[PDB]
Design a protein around this ligand. Structure first.
Ligand SMILES: [Mg+2]
Lengths: 54, 55
């Protein structure tokens, strides 16, 4: 499957400092839901992290 | 559900200061593969964080 792609997304999301608990949790759950949009979610997480930079 | 578990366990693991990157990535990947034993992975990761603390 696309396990490696979601594990990687999960890993990288854990390193986005400007995301809040709820958001990280949102991404995590969405990750396990549609393993296909993984790479997509990642990109969103990153853009969200910047959008929330101090 | 294990949703908060993975998030909190994940963050705690990545923030451990004496673990190197590859070790963190290994733990995180395992955490994902089996959210079931998250509690075990975290404890184990902490133990290793302690073993690698300054000597
Ligand atoms: Mg918050």
């Amino acid at each position: 499957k696309f396990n490696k792609e979601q594990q990687n997304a999960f890993y990288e999301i854990l390193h986005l400092p400007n995301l809040n608990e709820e958001q990280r949790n949102a991404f995590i759950q969405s990750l396990k839901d549609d393993p296909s949009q993984s790479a997509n979610l990642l990109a969103e997480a990153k853009k969200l992290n910047d959008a929330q930079a101090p | 559900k294990f949703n908060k578990e993975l998030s909190v366990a994940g963050r705690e693991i990545v923030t451990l200061p004496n673990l190197n990157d590859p070790q963190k990535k290994a733990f995180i990947f395992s955490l994902w593969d089996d959210p079931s034993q998250s509690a075990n992975l975290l404890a184990e990761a902490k133990k290793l964080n302690d073993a690698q603390a300054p000597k």
